[PDB]
Amino acid sequence: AQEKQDFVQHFSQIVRVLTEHPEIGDAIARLKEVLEYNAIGGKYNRGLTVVVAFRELVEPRKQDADSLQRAWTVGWCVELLQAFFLVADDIMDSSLTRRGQICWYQKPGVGLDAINDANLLEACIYRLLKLYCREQPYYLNLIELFLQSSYQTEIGQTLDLLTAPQGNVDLVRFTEKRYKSIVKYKAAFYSFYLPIAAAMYMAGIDGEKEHANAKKILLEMGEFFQIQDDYLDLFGDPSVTGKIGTDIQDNKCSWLVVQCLQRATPEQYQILKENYGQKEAEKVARVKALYEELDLPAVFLQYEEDSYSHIMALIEQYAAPLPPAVFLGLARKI
Amino acid sequence: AQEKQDFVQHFSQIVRVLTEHPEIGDAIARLKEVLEYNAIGGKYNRGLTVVVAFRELVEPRKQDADSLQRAWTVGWCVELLQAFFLVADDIMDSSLTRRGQICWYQKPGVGLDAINDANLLEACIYRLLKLYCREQPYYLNLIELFLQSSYQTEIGQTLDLLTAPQGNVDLVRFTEKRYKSIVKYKAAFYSFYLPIAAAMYMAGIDGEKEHANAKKILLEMGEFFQIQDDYLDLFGDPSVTGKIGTDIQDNKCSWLVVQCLQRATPEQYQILKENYGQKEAEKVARVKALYEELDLPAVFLQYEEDSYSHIMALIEQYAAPLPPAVFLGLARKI
Ligand SMILES: O=P(O)(O)C1(P(=O)(O)O)C[C@@H]2CCCN[C@@H]2C1
Ligand SMILES: O=P(O)(O)C1(P(=O)(O)O)C[C@@H]2CCCN[C@@H]2C1
Ligand SMILES: [Mg+2]
Ligand SMILES: [Mg+2]
Ligand SMILES: [Mg+2]
Ligand SMILES: [Mg+2]
Ligand SMILES: [Mg+2]
Ligand SMILES: [Mg+2]
């Protein structure tokens, strides 16, 4: 709440910096159009964390107006990365809405031009890092952090699509081992490691063990956030979530289907086999009815309880020498 | 011819390095599938230039087997970047074939999953640079070079799509000023600056003026290569080019249409207006007939002659202190 207006208000400086070649304005005009649609209307938790962690980890006397300017910019970089993956994930998952509005590629006049928009979002990350942090000692560390988070998330997307070929029956693919691999990579997308590591490096905290300890708390959290997202795909209210679910239709290796398969009788397996991964509303309804018969909502609620206590246990073990408050603020959103 | 087998043979080491987490092999297996389709069957001019320039610019006594290993790897990085842009450009331009085979996204079982494949290609650039060149003094310079070439090409793609909205008549957009902006950015894709700069940095040649001189020769060359590509879109034999042209159908600000507009009478402008940017075979035929009536092929031949002499003139002015042979080998392909 306290850092937001100044985070959001920086957006105008972000757009100015790239724009200032009469040519290049047009492209930044479309970037501007794309961000105003695709990185405006979110809760900005990931971006804001860079600033919130900055202020926790750098002594107030070192928090001059230029270092804040760099911190706001890096938080927005985290928001650009997220938007990059989302613009493209929605095309690939054939999604309808995000954030309560029609997905960007579904907008008339956009379509598969949204492929380039996504790539432009990603390209603008590294330009802004260059323009704001190039003379800084942590510059390479931050480039490598963004590149590595992007790699991890990308491998995740690749395993997601590979396990979910359209038009095919294979629940055999949907194993607990397979899901644990996919989620490990997808968690990189949700983990607050990227913005908390960024602020750490900006604070001059670059030790490998301290990074590995934080990464470990934050990765387990990222995994919970992906399982919650899988749950909310079907059982979430779209007016709260802002998006229509597609996992059943898309033949996805969801947490829900993996839990179903572990608890299904042979006949229940046949209902799943005949109904999963198809577009017909009445077939999706059948899968949802089965999940409810198996008490999967109750199973999720219990998993959420168990997972919260574990993350808190990891914070108690792994936070030091960082302030536990770095981790606990984010955990408050579990 | 002389560096190729060892460039191509390194591909196997490239795939090994990324693969060596049982998980990650699957994703590199698909990268492998994607490259074997999408970065195998080309002339490899861009990738091979890194090596050819390496050997010209580093004294033989400094050309140990590990530095060559790094050079082969960086050349392949240039090939990954090119493939990234091509995989995505073909989806966006609704293309049918490339390199004489069906475009990757047109393959049954691929489709819009090709969006992720492209992103994976790009992600693999920076991983390989990290794995091979991380301890090297030129490491940051090379990351920034790839990031900057990618930015320039991306802005180009953005201006290309913006000037060519589907379903619309506007030849008014198709001005000589507009084309000169688009091509400046698109030239980054063709310019051999990226692989020649890479070898320069690897040779410890990092002076800004020497880079700016080379960039200037190489950019004018890149512009010619884009104009040739525009020409070949319609007047090329697909069996030589490997690809079916889509520029007329796609409503593109091509060199051909810009030259047409500069030479058309008012009635010829009406034929263009009624026929450009549409899918009907008979309408495209009408535009091609008009271009021929305006002697656009002769105009291209003369432009090619004029442009070759100019590039040679820039080499004479700007090559020193690099060996002119750096530039002349590439020019041999004009
Ligand atoms: O579509 P979302 O937002 O639910 C999804 P995913 O398609 O389920 O996997 C897209 C996001 C980016 C990649 C990792 N997962 C999150 C969640
Ligand atoms: O489709 P190509 O290969 O002709 C093309 P473009 O769509 O005409 O513009 C794609 C390439 C990458 C970007 C720059 N142009 C080259 C040429
Ligand atoms: Mg999705
Ligand atoms: Mg997805
Ligand atoms: Mg989801
Ligand atoms: Mg094309
Ligand atoms: Mg194109
Ligand atoms: Mg072309």
UniProtKB/Swiss-Prot annotation, chains A, B:
Residues binding Mg(2+) 1, per UniProt: D89, D93
One record GO biological process: farnesyl diphosphate biosynthetic process
Binding site for isopentenyl diphosphate: K43, R46, Q82, R99
Residues the UniProt record annotates as site (Important for determining product chain length): F84, F85
Keywords: Acetylation, Cholesterol biosynthesis, Cholesterol metabolism, Cytoplasm, Disease variant, Host-virus interaction, Hydroxylation, Isoprene biosynthesis, Lipid biosynthesis, Lipid metabolism, Magnesium, Metal-binding, Steroid biosynthesis, Steroid metabolism, Sterol biosynthesis, Sterol metabolism, Transferase
Pathway info: Isoprenoid biosynthesis; farnesyl diphosphate biosynthesis; farnesyl diphosphate from geranyl diphosphate and isopentenyl diphosphate: step 1/1; Isoprenoid biosynthesis; geranyl diphosphate biosynthesis; geranyl diphosphate from dimethylallyl diphosphate and isopentenyl diphosphate: step 1/1
Entry's family note: Belongs to the FPP/GGPP synthase family.
Protein known as: Farnesyl pyrophosphate synthase
Protein's organism: Homo sapiens
